[model samples]
Target: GSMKMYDRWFSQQELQVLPFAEQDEQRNQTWLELVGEAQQLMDERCPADEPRAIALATRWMEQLEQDTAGRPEFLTRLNEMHAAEPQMREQTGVTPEMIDFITRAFAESKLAIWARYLNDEELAFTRQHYFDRLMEWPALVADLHRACREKRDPASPGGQQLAQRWLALFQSYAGKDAQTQQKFRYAMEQEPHLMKGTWMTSEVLSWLQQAIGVMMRQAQGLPPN
Candidate 1:
């Protein structure tokens, strides 16, 4: 609301159709299939460059696209949750190890889906820089968790400071261009799963969002709730 990013993507009436806080049973069932598929591919242990592995990797990307099809805005909402609140990829039944493996596999192939929004130069930068960038995320998630534990109120100076950094982390990806943000978000938000095996639980994310909501209000020169 501070930068009014929502106004650009959502119409007044259309806003009623926003994604749920979590996936429905049907979506959850589909994602479980993908998770099973992913584990199957990982079990093969073939070198990523091997012919059969490459074919499976290509299929993996297509399946991911299918998973998010016709509903990119789910990411619009999910990105806000991830950016403002703490979450573990593991919480969604996704492991950091799998994120590492799948991302590397896609990059190795120069897969077209990986290049959808990125140009050669941008993609080159991603290839050169993104792995270390992943290293940065878990620490930041930890930091946000610690801050939420301590501050508990966005109007507090500690809360305000934490929210500012988290906001910048998101703006790094979802900055000025609307389509680019939406495009990148689809890849980022694939294979939906719920919180488990990790920290970002309901209460923690709730408190963090309460604070973030206040932070948004403060940015607009309003008093926090």
Candidate 2:
């Protein structure tokens, strides 16, 4: 039950940072449990077709409304959960298409579901800045998947170079200057929303940080740490 484990871990982390009231604790627990239940529905072939997808999505919403007493903000929290931690979504064998189906159902429902709590100007700025990637998400996701497949075999031709290039990209601000790279790292590490649309995970981010340091040392003909 990796889903349950994640639910517990997330709950514990949040509780330590800001204590929860009785109602808040109940709502939070219900949401975390519902995340696991939602995955279970996907596993049970409830997201295989349109009807089932709708059914499952409806049921999920109903449960959330029951727990949250019809608050709209919890739905927003669910969207944030889905967006921020790509790894959580990966734990189940849910297809991207199925997730899209479920989310569409949620959006079409009779709830005050605001996708993002952003004002007009802020939303405009984000949309303009991420316009290209927003339009090309599927293709970019495909490319990223291909790169991951290639990454599995570092001994393969061009694999080492690919790793180095990816590491550099991760460490730098997309090939910007060193100062900008530092700022980029700070943004990435501190702001989860900055990573919302990508497949990057905390596990991989930390690993890349260490791997790049080791690679730099090796390139300078220094001994291993």
Candidate 3:
């Protein structure tokens, strides 16, 4: 399904913009430039105490590749970095402000680069997918927080059941499905201020993508693509 969606989306764009077969060299060069720019920015702005910055930046780049499906080797190297430096995060002191700045910069760069290289239809599809995920993130976090708070023994039978219920409720709203939209409505009903200013901006999306990428690279085999 995803491949078909990708193919349809790509077909609407100019072949020059798609990285499948006709534009391998151009795509590789573009990816290298993106990786370089991201790394340079991270090096310049990341907090000195944050030794894990490289790993974090690499993870973010890997996610960018995954999101676009053009740079698998980049993603592999990112995974290797995490594996080589297993305690990177623990050793690094990542301040909230630094995190915010890095995230904003990365997202802005990602969107800009994608826009510059991708055709209108391709960019639209990417944005749509990204936005769908952004819409689900906050509610998912809220659900997890609620689960942790409500469960007396998070690993116990009763607690596990409660957690599952919470997870199911969140899953119902975790995508573009009708149930997900309904969950959003239910959430808004209780919290009228749920919709805030630019809550799902490119910056936030970049940060989330990076964070998830790093977590997966560290715990799983590699970042998803």
Candidate 4:
């Protein structure tokens, strides 16, 4: 099966309905059957350019579509499975050397599913979504570290100054302060058209929510606000 055939298979609504686990089991079984059928077909029909492996994978995805209707649950499970290192090790006994290969395959499978359900632009935005979250992680961590250090030694003038600096940086990024929020609003207003992409809307919202949640946890007893 070619990529076109693979795309067609996921177009079915029924396939998207099945739970992710059930879909995976069904897809694997279907792949095995397709591989067997392809091997026999290649022996008699066309001896060359068979693409047995690719055909098997594509057929499996087709079967998957038939099993599940297009559901957000499927995508959620795919993301969890792709990111789950401990679960992969426990289930597959996969070694460190195979980690990269498994991770890439997992990501590709997710992208394939996304491509079937989302438009080209949405798919591109989805691919970069995690990177957007990652960009803020270091800054959040640094802010938390600074907060803890200051709280531990409030008597030190130098520590107090560093704490204020960290707090100002955090407030700027969070847009919680009135001045910072106004500046952000003005910038956004000036470039209202910049919000046309999914990255600014979906990815940025996701990152902001996560960053704030983490900072709140780290904040402890800083202030009432």
Candidate-wise lDDT, in order: 0.50, 0.45, 0.42, 0.40
RMSD of each: 15.3, 15.2, 18.9, 16.5
Q: Write the per-residue lDDT of candidate 2 for residues 110-168, one digit (tens) a residue.
A: 11121133344433433344223332333333333454544544334444454466544
Candidate 1 residues lying further than 4 Å off, grouped into runs, are: 1-132, 177-191, 194-199, 218-225
Q: In what order do the candidates fall by lDDT, top score first?
A: 1, 2, 3, 4
- Can you give the lDDT of residue 87 in candidate 3? 46
lDDT of 3: 0.42
Superposition error at 79 for model 4 (Å) = 3.4
True-structure lDDT of candidate 1: 0.50
Off by over 4 Å in 3: 1-23, 46-82, 85-225
Best by lDDT: 1
Q: Per-prediction TM-score, please?
A: 0.37, 0.29, 0.24, 0.24
Q: Which scores higher on TM-score, 2 or 4?
A: 2
Residue 124 of candidate 2: its Cα lDDT?
43
In candidate 4, position 155 carries an lDDT of 28
Q: Where in model 4 is the C-alpha error above 4 Å? A: 1-17, 20-50, 92-225
